[PDB]
Amino acid sequence: AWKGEVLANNEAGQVTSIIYNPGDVITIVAAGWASYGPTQKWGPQGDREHPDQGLICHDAFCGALVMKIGNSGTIPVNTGLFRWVAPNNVQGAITLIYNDVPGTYGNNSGSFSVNIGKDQS
Amino acid sequence: AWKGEVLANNEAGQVTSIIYNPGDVITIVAAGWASYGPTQKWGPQGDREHPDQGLICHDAFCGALVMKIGNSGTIPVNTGLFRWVAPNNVQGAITLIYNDVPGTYGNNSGSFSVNIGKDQS
Amino acid sequence: AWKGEVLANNEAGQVTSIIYNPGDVITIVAAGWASYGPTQKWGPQGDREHPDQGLICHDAFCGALVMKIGNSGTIPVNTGLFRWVAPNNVQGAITLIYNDVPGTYGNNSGSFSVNIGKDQS
Amino acid sequence: AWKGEVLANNEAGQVTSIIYNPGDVITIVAAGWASYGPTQKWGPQGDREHPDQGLICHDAFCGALVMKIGNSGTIPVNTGLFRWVAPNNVQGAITLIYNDVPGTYGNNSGSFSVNIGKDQS
Numbered sequence A, B, C, D: 001a002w003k004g005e006v007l008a009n010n011e012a013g014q015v016t017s018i019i020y021n022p023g024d025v026i027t028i029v030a031a032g033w034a035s036y037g038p039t040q041k042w043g044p045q046g047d048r049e050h051p052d053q054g055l056i057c058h059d060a061f062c063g064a065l066v067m068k069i070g071n072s073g074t075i076p077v078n079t080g081l082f083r084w085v086a087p088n089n090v091q092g093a094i095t096l097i098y099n100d101v102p103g104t105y106g107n108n109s110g111s112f113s114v115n116i117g118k119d120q121s
């Protein structure tokens, strides 16, 4: 299991100790407050009212928590995933990332606190 | 396990099929959008900017997801709980509840989706 | 989870810290060597050659590991149980017991080492 | 999870679907009756009275259940493993094998019924 923080201004994402292998079932729970620029902060679902201006993940809101598994595309995480199997046979190290537009991370603030564990299988 | 929705307008909350017993380890993941009156909506951590005017749970923000276990007082859930064990004594059915001031749920809207499961212990 | 020894000469059995509640899924692994009287010893499946002369559990061999849940009748455990649900209407503390004839435990020897855990549900 | 049987007369062993990866926690439960040649039978701990005349696993009795993980040496299983983590650098498919002297499996009989699962980690 892994626990740690994902900073909103960290464009490269936060590598975890979790390697997702074939057959794994995982659960993720994320909490906390972050911003992509505004004074206001949002939780791990991000800002539902904000337009997509070239986000790294088009299937989550600006300011949401997302991830990559190995060489996968970005996958939404939001507040978390319950007893979840990765689609399309993706595998590898899990990296958590704040959803913003590339090159605009420098004004971001806050972080999310994230737990990931493997479940029974 | 149990999956369902918790309406922001329901002062009675949503009973689940999960009975929390001593020593149980549980995980909850919550998502969605709700409001305690204003046009804006917030996720399950609620509105960090809003003062407590008599909330049912003084340890979570207005608009956050909380729960009771049996006849306990309210306990924060927020975006969820990861492999969590209760304080000694609580037992009984989990009921999920939107955090607002009693008598003021009339103008509330939206809902949270929630998954609850028992973990290894 | 619980880990402990169950002595073969212990007619009252070994009460564990595990309380089986409705809906629980459990796993048990048992190991070791014990005798109901003879000089040789057998594992937790007992002695497949030995006739039943009034055992506390008629559905396991003499020298097998069995259990009660609360005030239930005896239930076979043998080498263990994998992700097992109890019959309806059985609940309470798990007590582990060596399978022998009542009043004949005095000449028994050895013990079984047992682990019990609750699984995801 | 894998469920199946391991024949006493199968010298090559039984290659399961469980790929043990770094960090995994596994549980195995084994049951049943088998023999290395005699008309008598033993459970998955094998025959405690029998000398070791060149067994594939010297840390278990003749007639016990043992395993390999990838290209590891043999590891005793006996009646099972409870929430077990492998030695460092040990990884790969789990092969289950009856413990007998090489070249002497042809007179063996019976089988053990075996369940393997991955636990939470």
Ligand SMILES: CCNC(=O)[C@@H]1C[C@H](NC(=O)[C@H](Cc2cn(CCNC(=O)c3ccc(S[C@@H]4O[C@H](CO)[C@H](O)[C@H](O)[C@H]4O)cc3)nn2)NC)CN1
Binding pocket: D036, D037, D038, D040, D049, D050, D051, D052, D053, D062, D100, D101, D104, D105, D107
């Ligand atoms: C008719 C007599 N039957 C029996 O004795 C059987 C076997 C068990 N025996 C006992 O528990 C005791 C104690 C005992 C003493 N020894 C050492 C002498 N026996 C011996 O060395 C031996 C060796 C081999 C075999 S069978 C043989 O085993 C090989 C691997 O070791 C291989 O698998 C071959 O394919 C297989 O044929 C038997 C005995 N050992 N145990 N004696 C009463 C209980 N009933």
Ligand SMILES: [Ca+2]
Binding pocket: A036, A037, A100, A104, A105, A106, A107, A108
């Ligand atoms: Ca930004």
Ligand SMILES: [Ca+2]
Binding pocket: B036, B037, B100, B104, B105, B106, B107, B108
């Ligand atoms: Ca309101």
Ligand SMILES: [Ca+2]
Binding pocket: C036, C037, C100, C101, C104, C105, C106, C107, C108
């Ligand atoms: Ca006896």
Ligand SMILES: [Ca+2]
Binding pocket: D036, D037, D100, D104, D105, D106, D107, D108
């Ligand atoms: Ca043989």
